[PDB]
């Protein structure tokens, strides 16, 4: 599972590793291609390069080169002159599989052209035309891939959040920036006494309606269009549990402090604020994959940045809540508890 | 290689790290951080948003390219040696050649369906894009060095006088061979687009009196008439041709070998099953992306062609490569 924990150190320590790193993008592109053209749907049964080539309109000799490279990767098994999917490929890379990771792969290959534009991003105070806030209104494909990819990638933590003890005696939940809404839906399924609100932007609303109906939660969840940066949007809101899951990294530090404060203000006495965030120490370099994630988010959105976990925890304390925590692989779940008296 | 869904997602995402390195090299960031710089200093230097420069510098520290010493980021020993423009060991051209391919790889679907070269493939691009041609040549020069050393120490040269390097290109193999064996003279036979690369190598080793460059198309049998050398070389080059073509080129090459001499072929090792060694199947695809008929041919097939040409084949495996030594009989 991808959420599983990671090393403090990721340093390159040899020139070989340096050239390999500069070259490693090619393997991504190969997988991206095989997935995009749905090659592995054809190879659910054994095919020769002639048969693959005829199906796809390829040069036979070139199809053979590709199939050999895919076999060498462990994605195909060559039996005689025929190629067929391996167990891994059949399970995760066939469109008909319940475990298909197409959306994740598609979300990833759709960012290919953005990464070489690092120099422009670094030099812009404003969102650039290719970042998510500028892209998702017109690029339904990229919006849906991203939302579907997050639902899949988030599942390990969804299962942990849904078993938290703060829900057992709670009645109401607010999911801030809830988006796809998988955390709230799974929490409500498990806890029949709960009702829920999802507070997010217009772009997420169809994804929420899918999730809600998919889990049969029609009469238990309401969707609200809300701007989490606008304090007035929080007037008169209150719940036993308020969630900010895997979303603070869309905000700069000033913004993130304001969102945490507003969120905390929604928490009823005896209630809890939950913040799920990738674990990052105050040094901003440990664990190593946290620094990578911060940069990833900076490429994706103007203010993208992973804030240190101890800094987030201090903001929750500053809001007057007692902070507990839980490790979920590479993530930390912070639980801010409001005293009842 | 890939055995779990986590491996798949990682493989699909791993391109981002290439792009990060490509950028830092392209902008010469590591030339600035030869001296320790704060993110504020780096941002001021490049006209960046300070906060964003800090996110980048932290990510580069996490990759082991920079060290954060208090408030300041400085090159690590690795970076200083390989990623500063003034280092004798700078790998800039390797990284440049690699980043100039970025847009080619997502076009696999087009390449697979094309019988003809595409505009980004070497045979077209290098006619029109001098920067790309030169990055490739300088990159090959550096990447060839381990095999160049092995080839230069071979015993066939001990008692030769003349050498022909077919599709020799940058000519580094021939140059080291001549440096090691002062009695030898040589020729490089290749296309016009490699002549500048060949001259740079010839003059770098003051080999102008001992080496001649000849513009030659290796698929034209007429270009071989009159030619003769004690040693003839096809170093790391048969993967530019399809099987029919490679067979013709090996036959022409063998014909250039004088009685008692040798044909040397250096080729990445490929078994008949074409899936092992695994990195060789990858190299075959890499070559298909780079050039229309790009393809790594099985080593035993190459060896059989040399035998058909009348040469007795000796084989040696060095790292990921096989050196085939095709011996021509004396007296013929």
CATH of the domain at B60: 1.10.10.10
Contacts of B10 (CB under 8 A, 6+ apart): none
Tell whether A126 lies on the interface with B, counting CB pairs under 8 A: no
Q: What are phi and psi of B198, to 5 degrees?
A: -60, -45
Q: Which of A241, A263, A264, A265 is nearest to A170 (CA)?
A: A241
Tell me the CA distances in angstroms from B184 to A29, B49, B160, B229, one per residue in order. Answer: 45, 59, 7, 10
**Interface touch B109/A33, C-beta < 8 Å:** yes
B98 and B20 inside one domain:
no
Rounded-to-integer distance, Cα A273 and Cα B166, Å: 71
Given B85, B100, B129, the domain boundary residue is B85
Given A76, A95, A114, the domain boundary residue is A95
Which CATH number covers residue B106? 3.40.50.150
Question: Which DSSP helix (H) or strand (E) runs through A71?
Answer: helix A60-72
Rounded-to-integer distance, Cα A9 and Cα A289, Å: 9
Residues in chain A, total: 341
| Beta strand spans in chain B (E) | 66-69, 72-75, 162-166, 185-190, 211-215, 229-235, 257-268, 312-318, 321-327
Under 8 Å between Cβ of A148 and A175: no
C-alpha B261: how far from its chain's center?
A: 27
A246 and A134 inside one domain:
yes
Domain assignment present for A20: yes
Domain assignment present for A6: no
Strand partners, B235: B266
List chain B residues with CB under 8 Å of A57.
Answer: 113
Rounded-to-integer distance, Cα A264 and Cα A313, Å: 12
Given A49, A70, A95, the domain boundary residue is A95
Which technique was used to obtain these atomic coordinates? X-ray
Q: Which of B249, B228, B229, B230 is nearest to B238 (CA)?
A: B249
Under 8 Å between Cβ of B253 and B216: no
Which residue in A4, A14, A73 has the most chain B C-beta atoms within 10 A of its own C-beta, making it the best mutation to test that interface? A73
Structural domain for A188, as ranges: 96-341
State how many domains chain A has. 2
Rounded-to-integer distance, Cα B71 and Cα A247, Å: 28
Q: Within 13 A of B57's CA, how many CA atoms are on the CB side? A: 29
Domain assignment present for A80: yes
B81 and B91 inside one domain:
no
Query: A99-103 long-range CB contacts below 8 Å, 24 or more apart?
Result: A99/B5, A101/A152, A101/B5, A101/B8, A101/B9, A102/A35, A103/A144, A103/A145, A103/A148, A103/A149, A103/A152
Question: Which DSSP helix (H) or strand (E) runs through A106?
Answer: helix A102-109
A171 and A74 inside one domain:
no
A54 and A121 inside one domain:
no
Rounded-to-integer distance, Cα B233 and Cα B188, Å: 10
Tell me the CA distances in angstroms from A319 to A230, A248, A266, B39, one per residue in order. Answer: 17, 16, 11, 31
Domain assignment present for A4: no
Which residue in A7, A27, A70, A153 has the most chain B C-beta atoms within 10 A of its own C-beta, making it the best mutation to test that interface? A27
Q: Which of B215, B267, B280, B213 is nearest to B241 (CA)?
A: B267
Using CB atoms, pick whichever of A9, A13, A124 lies closest to residue B78.
A13
**Partner A, chain B 301-320, Cβ-Cβ below 8 Å:** none
Instruction: Classify residue A45 as left (phi > 0), alpha (psi -120 to 50) or beta.
Output: beta
Domain assignment present for A83: yes
A62 and A149 inside one domain:
no
B69 and B170 inside one domain:
no
Domain assignment present for A284: yes
**Partner A, chain B 238-267, Cβ-Cβ below 8 Å:** 242
State the DSSP string of B70-89.
TTEEEE-HHHHHHSSTTSTT
Tell the residue number behind the tokens 């830092």, with chain if given.
B24
Under 8 Å between Cβ of A76 and A41: no
Tell me the CA distances in angstroms from A272 to A164, A186, B54, B321, one per residue in order. Answer: 11, 18, 33, 62
Q: What is the resolution of this structure in A?
A: 1.9
Q: At what angle do helices B15-26 and A15-23 cross, to 10 degrees?
A: 110
A230 and A163 inside one domain:
yes
Instruction: Classify residue B39 as left (phi > 0), alpha (psi -120 to 50) or beta.
Output: alpha
Distance from CA of A311 to the nearest CA of B (A): 16
**Interface touch A72/B275, C-beta < 8 Å:** yes
B29 and B110 inside one domain:
no
Positive or negative: CA dihedral A83, A87, A89, A93: positive
A79 and A204 inside one domain:
no
Using CB atoms, pick whichever of A15, A121, A290 lies closest to residue B52.
A121
Contacts of B206 (CB under 8 A, 6+ apart): none
Rounded-to-integer distance, Cα A331 and Cα A315, Å: 18
Using CB atoms, pick whichever of A4, A32, A119 lies closest to residue B106.
A32
Tell me the CA distances in angstroms from B268 to B242, B278, B317, one per residue in order. Answer: 15, 11, 9
Q: At what angle do helices A288-300 and B15-26 cross, to 10 degrees?
A: 80
Q: What are phi and psi of B156, to 5 degrees?
A: -60, -25
Rounded-to-integer distance, Cα B253 and Cα B165, Å: 10
Classified as helix, coil or strand, A127 is coil
Instruction: Classify residue B94 as left (phi > 0), alpha (psi -120 to 50) or beta.
Output: alpha
Instruction: Classify residue A329 as left (phi > 0), alpha (psi -120 to 50) or beta.
Output: left
A192 and A317 inside one domain:
yes
Classified as helix, coil or strand, B321 is strand
**Interface touch B91/A125, C-beta < 8 Å:** no
Classified as helix, coil or strand, B221 is helix
Instruction: Establish whether the linkage from the previous residue to A51 is cis, with ω within 30° of 0.
Output: no
Domain assignment present for A217: yes
- Residues in chain A that come right before a backbone break, where C and next N are over 2.5 Å apart: none
B63 and B180 inside one domain:
no
**Partner A, chain B 40-99, Cβ-Cβ below 8 Å:** 46-49, 51-56, 58-59, 61-65, 68, 76, 78, 81-83, 89, 91, 94-95, 98-99
């Amino acid at each position: 599972t991808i959420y599983e924990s990671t090393e403090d150190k990721a340093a390159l320590t040899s020139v070989v590793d340096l050239v390999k790193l500069s070259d490693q993008y090619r393997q991504s592109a190969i997988l991206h291609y095989a997935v995009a053209d749905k090659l592995f749907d054809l190879t659910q049964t054994g095919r020769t390069p002639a048969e693959v080539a005829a199906s796809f309109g390829m040069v036979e000799g070139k199809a053979a080169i590709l199939l050999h490279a895919l076999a060498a990767l462990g994605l195909l098994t060559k039996e005689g002159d025929a190629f067929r999917n391996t167990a891994l490929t059949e399970r995760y890379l066939t469109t008909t599989s319940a475990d298909y990771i197409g959306p994740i792969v598609e979300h990833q290959y759709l960012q290919w052209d953005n990464w070489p534009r690092l120099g422009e991003i670094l030099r812009s105070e404003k969102p650039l035309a290719f970042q998510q806030e500028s892209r998702f209104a017109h690029d339904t494909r990229a919006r849906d891939a991203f939302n579907d990819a997050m639902v899949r990638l988030s599942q390990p933590m969804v299962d942990v959040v849904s078993e938290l003890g703060v829900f057992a005696r709670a009645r109401t939940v607010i999911d801030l920036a809830g988006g796809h809404g998988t955390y709230l839906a799974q929490v409500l399924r498990r806890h029949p006494q709960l009702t829920g609100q999802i507070w997010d932007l217009p772009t997420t609303r169809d994804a929420a309606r899918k999730t809600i109906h998919a889990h049969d939660l029609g009469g238990r969840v309401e969707f609200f269009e809300k701007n989490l940066l606008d304090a007035r949007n929080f007037e008169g809101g209150a719940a036993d549990v308020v969630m900010l899951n895997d979303c603070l990294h869309y905000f700069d530090a000033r913004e993130a402090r304001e969102v945490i404060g507003h969120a905390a203000g929604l928490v009823k006495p005896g209630g809890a604020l939950l913040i799920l965030t990738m674990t990052m120490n105050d040094d901003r370099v440990t664990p190593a994959l946290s620094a990578d994630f911060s940069l990833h988010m900076m490429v994706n959105t103007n203010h993208g940045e992973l804030h240190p976990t101890p800094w987030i925890a201090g903001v929750v304390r500053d809001a007057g809540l007692a902070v507990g925590e839980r490790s979920i692989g590479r993530y930390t779940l912070l639980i801010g508890q409001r005293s009842s008296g």
